[PDB]
Amino acid sequence: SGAIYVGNYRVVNRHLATHNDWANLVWEDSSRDLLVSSTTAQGCDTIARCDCQTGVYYCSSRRKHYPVSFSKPSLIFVEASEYYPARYQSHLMLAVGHSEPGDCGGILRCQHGVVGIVSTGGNGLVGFADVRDLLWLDEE
Ligand SMILES: Cc1ccc2c(C(=O)NCCc3cocn3)c[nH]c2c1
Ligand SMILES: [Zn+2]
Numbered sequence: 162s163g164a165i166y167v168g169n170y171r172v173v174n175r176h177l178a179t180h181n182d183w184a185n186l187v188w189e190d191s192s193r194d195l196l197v198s199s200t201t202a203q204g205c206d207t208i209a210r211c212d213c214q215t216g217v218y219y220c221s222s223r224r225k226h227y228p229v230s231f232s233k234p235s236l237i238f239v240e241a242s243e244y245y246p247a248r249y250q251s252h253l254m255l256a257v258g259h260s261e262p263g264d265c266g267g268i269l270r271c272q273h274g275v276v277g278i279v280s281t282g283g284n285g286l287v288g289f290a291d292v293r294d295l296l297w298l299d300e301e
Contacts, residue, residue, distance in 0.1 A: 163219070163266025165275050166204025167298050172197050174265045174280055174290070176244035192251045194244075194280040194290050197298075208298050209273035216271035218279065218287065222261045229256035231269070234291040239281050252291045253281060260287030 165172035173182060175189055175196040182198040189196040217228050231254040239250045242262060254269075260282025267279040269289045281288030292298065 162221070162263065163268065163278060165206050165208075165268065165278060165292065166200065167206045167208055167275070168301070169200050169203060170197050170298055171200050171204075172278065172292060172298070174278060177265060190251075191245075192249070193253075194250060195292070197295075206268075207274040208295070209271050209276050209293050210296075211271060211273045211293065213271035213273065213276065216269050216276055218256070218258065218269040218289070219267035220259055220279075220287075221264050221267055223259060227258050229258050229269075229287075231256040231289065234294070237288070239288070240283070242281075250281065250288070250290075252294070254289045254291055255281075256287055256289070257285055258282075258287040259285070 175194050178196040185198045187197040217226050234252045236251050237253050241247045264279050269276045277289040277291040280290045
């Protein structure tokens with residue numbers, strides 16, 4: 162589990178969105194595994210605006226933050242999980258690291274701010290849904 166809280170927005174994995182998220186929906190995209198809902202309070206996270214390929218992510222199944230090198234956001238085939246059938250997921254970055262299903266939502270950050278959240282993974286992999294192209298998260 163986990164979310165990004167920027168401005169009056171809450172960014173979560175679409176497959177972990179709650180009824181309150183869906184009742185206060187701003188934007189969602191199944192192909193990216195992302196959903197954004199509105200919040201009453203303002204958040205503290207800042208979004209990175211960059212092309213970094215190195216950063217640090219939180220792994221809840223280890224209670225640890227790990228430094229990683231990651232690929233640029235791309236369209237990558239992803240195998241079935243409990244939330245989606247095997248399918249192409251867009252705007253996805255891969256790194257070598259540990260990821261179990263409940264690790265979804267952990268933040269990946271670089272020197273500029275938040276880069277994305279955990280969504281995919283397995284056999285020494287972990288995939289992140291990028292948010293650096295969502296420029297509207299910085300306004301309204
Ligand atoms: C071993 C293993 C198995 C499953 C996962 C996993 C997961 O279930 N969430 C994916 C949400 C999703 C995107 O695409 C498909 N399903 C995240 N890390 C894992 C690691
Ligand atoms: Zn950066």
